[PDB]
Amino acid sequence: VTIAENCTINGTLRAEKIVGDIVKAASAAFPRQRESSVDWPSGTRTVTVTDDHPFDRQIVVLPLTFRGSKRTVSGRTTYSMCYLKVLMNGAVIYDGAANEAVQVFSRIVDMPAGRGNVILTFTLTSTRHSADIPPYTFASDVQVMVIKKQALGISVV
Amino acid sequence: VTIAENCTINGTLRAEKIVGDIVKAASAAFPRQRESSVDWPSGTRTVTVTDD
C-alpha cells in the first residue's frame, strides 16, 4: 500500500517494522571487575546501529557520568583515574579522564543514509591507588538513542 | 485512508509523521566560542514542538 497523504487508524495498529520518526534506544552497563568486597567498572560495550533507514539519523549518547577518586594514607596521596574512550568505527572520537570531579559525556553522532553500519565502542578503564588498594571509580550506564533529524514533530535550531 | 478498526502490517511500515502514544526526541549542542587553543560553550539553542 502506498498512501500519499494522511492515514488514520481508529483501532489498533499492529506493525512489525516501523521506519518513522520514532525513537530507538539501547542501553547497557559496563562490566564490573571485583576483588574481596569491592568492584569497579572496567570493560567495553559495543553498540551497532544498522543503516536500514532511508533518511539520515542522529545517534545521541545521553549523559554518562564517570568519576575517579583520591585517597590520602599516612600523608601520601594516591589517585584512581577513570578513563573513558569512545570510538566511532574504530576512530577515537572521545578520550576523557576523571580523577576527583565527575565528567559527563553526551554526544551527537551523525549517521547518514547508505554510509554503512555505525559501531560505537565505549571502553572504560580504572587504575588502582597502589598495588594493594584496588581502584575506586564510578561510571553510569551507557544509553544510546537514535533520532530522525529535521523531523516534523520536534525541531531544533 | 480511514480505518475504523485494527490494521495489521506483516512487513515494513514507513510513515513520515506518526501521531499517537509515541516518544519524540531532538538534541543539539551549544555553540562553542574559541580563542587560541581553548573553546567554551556560549550560545543559544531553540527547540520547537508542534501542537499536532
Curated annotation (Swiss-Prot), chain A:
Q: Kindly list the places in or outside the cell where this protein is found, as annotated in its UniProt entry.
A: Virion; Host cytoplasm
Residues covered by region (Interaction with host LamB) = 1-157
| Recorded superkingdom | Viruses
Function per UniProt: Attaches the virion to the host receptor LamB, inducing viral DNA ejection. During tail assembly, initiates distal tail tip assembly by interacting with gpI, gpL and gpK. During virus entry to host cell, binds strongly to host LamB in an irreversible attachment. The binding induces structural changes in the tail leading to viral DNA injection through LamB trimeric pore.
Q: Which family does the record claim for this protein?
A: Belongs to the Caudoviricetes tip attachment protein J family.
Record text on subunit structure and interactions: Interacts with host LamB.
Q: What is this protein called?
A: Tip attachment protein J
Native source organism of the sequence = Escherichia phage lambda (Bacteriophage lambda)
Q: Organism classification, top ranks?
A: Viruses, Duplodnaviria, Heunggongvirae, Uroviricota, Caudoviricetes
